[PDB]
Design a protein around this ligand. Structure first.
Ligand SMILES: NC(=O)c1ccc[n+]([C@@H]2O[C@H](COP(=O)([O-])OP(=O)(O)OC[C@H]3O[C@@H](n4cnc5c(N)ncnc54)[C@H](OP(=O)(O)O)[C@@H]3O)[C@@H](O)[C@H]2O)c1
Length: 325
């Protein structure tokens, strides 16, 4: 079935997506310049054909540098690489969608992106700051209009600037808003949300499957555990007893077990690593498989507790995690 050489799964719009990709979020403060570029190149050399990034990660130019270098040397052709970009909360105004995508295309120095998604369903005040706030720290929220923003996204696909359209951090309600939109042209093909053994997303996954929407698991390894977005009080995913015991069984690390778990269930995983050894380690998940019993025991680790709660925005009209799923 899935192999290092061939592991692309179908998207509802006729395109396909590599089941594993390299995540590229890294704290700008503690990340050396060029680390992303080096990592993307190593990832491609290793076998990765999917790179997940975002303009707001401040390293999209490094992602493009790496992809273009690998294409220039003949390591891969543009069609062999799948890049996902994202539209941040401060660029949801309809008239801003295309210009925002065009910026990313210029930053990457590519003609199109394979997948472009609404980064979060919440809309923030447009400007030169991703986190709009006043002297009181009070978050400057903007009226969201998902359907209108989606229509703008649709025009980008119509123009050929992006192959597939998707969303991120969208709950059932929000997905239905688009799925039931009058005159819907392009249905979302992917929903990128936190997903791993401690938060298996059973209900959202089933809902998405009913609409041929593929889930992409962000923070598939349980996050970098940065106190800014994660509670360091929670037990680390990679230290889980079962995950480590199963690792011993297959002589694989807990990270490899968790990644195999999700891809075996049809969930795309985009683990991030800027470390040579770990980039390679995370890709070695096609030489073994988990038994039905092991898959069930791993899914049973689900705590229905997420690592990324985005609690600072729980007051936004579009908060995604207030509802069950
Ligand atoms: N759309 C959204 O809202 C959203 C939110 C968060 C993330 N994402 C995307 O999802 C990608 C993945 O998530 P994430 O970066 O939060 O988390 P992650 O992939 O779950 O975990 C990354 C952390 O794990 C370490 N790591 C990587 N491989 C490892 C291995 N084999 N063993 C032990 N530790 C390992 C990394 O350090 P080293 O680099 O030193 O290996 C890093 O600290 C992002 O980079 C981004 O592209 C999207």
């Amino acid at each position: 079935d899935l192999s290092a050489a061939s592991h692309r799964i179908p998207l509802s719009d006729g395109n396909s997506i590599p089941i594993i990709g390299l995540g590229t979020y890294s704290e700008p403060k503690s990340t050396p310049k060029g680390a992303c570029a080096t990592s993307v190149k190593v990832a491609i050399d290793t076998g990765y054909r999917h790179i997940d990034g975002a303009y707001i990660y401040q390293n999209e130019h490094e992602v493009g540098e790496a992809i273009r270098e690998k294409i220039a040397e003949g390591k891969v052709r543009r069609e062999d690489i799948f890049y996902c970009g994202k539209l941040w909360a401060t660029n949801h105004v309809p008239e801003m969608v295309r210009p925002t995508l065009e910026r990313t295309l210029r930053v990457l120095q590519l003609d199109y992106v394979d997948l472009y998604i609404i980064e979060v369903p919440m809309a923030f005040k447009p400007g030169d700051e991703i986190y709009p706030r006043d002297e009181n720290g009070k978050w400057l929220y903007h009226k969201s209009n998902l359907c209108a923003t989606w229509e703008a996204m649709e025009a980008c696909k119509d123009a050929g600037l992006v192959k597939s359209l998707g969303v991120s951090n969208f709950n059932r309600r929000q997905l239905e808003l688009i799925l039931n939109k009058p005159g819907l042209k392009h249905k979302p093909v992917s929903n990128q949300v936190e997903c791993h053994p401690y938060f298996t997303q059973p209900k959202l996954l089933k809902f998405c499957q009913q609409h041929d929407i593929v889930i992409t698991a962000y923070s598939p390894l349980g996050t970098s555990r940065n106190p800014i977005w994660v509670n360091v009080s929670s037990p680390p995913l990679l230290k889980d007893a079962l995950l480590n015991s199963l690792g011993k069984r297959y002589n694989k690390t807990a990270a490899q077990i968790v990644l195999r778990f999700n891809i075996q269930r049809g969930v795309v995983v985009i683990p991030k690593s800027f470390n040579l050894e770990r980039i390679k380690e995370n890709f070695q998940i096609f030489d073994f498989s988990l038994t039905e019993e092991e898959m069930k025991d791993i899914e049973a680790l689900n705590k229905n507790v997420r690592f990324v709660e985005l609690l600072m925005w729980r007051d936004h009209p579009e908060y995604p995690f207030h509802d069950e799923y």
